[PDB]
Design a protein around this ligand. Sequence first.
Ligand code: ZN
Ligand code: ZN
Length: 71
Amino acid sequence: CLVCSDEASGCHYGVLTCGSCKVFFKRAVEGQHNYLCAGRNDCIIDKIRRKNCPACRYRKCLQAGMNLEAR
Ligand SMILES: [Zn+2]
Ligand SMILES: [Zn+2]
C-alpha cells in the first residue's frame, strides 16, 4: 500500500494500494462515494497500521494517487 504500507499489487486498478482499498474504492466509487474523513486533520491510516478512520483511507487513496480505472 502506497498509503498504509500493507503490500499491494498492480492489477486492474493500477494504483497499488493494498487489494482491499482498491476493491473498496471500487464499491465506494459505485455506492458509498466520497469518504471525507472524520475530518480529523489528515488522519493517519499508516505507520502503526491501525484504521483510525475508514473514511480517511479512500481520501488518501486519492492522495497516493489511486483511482479506480488505473490512474
Ligand atoms: Zn492499503
Ligand atoms: Zn481519517
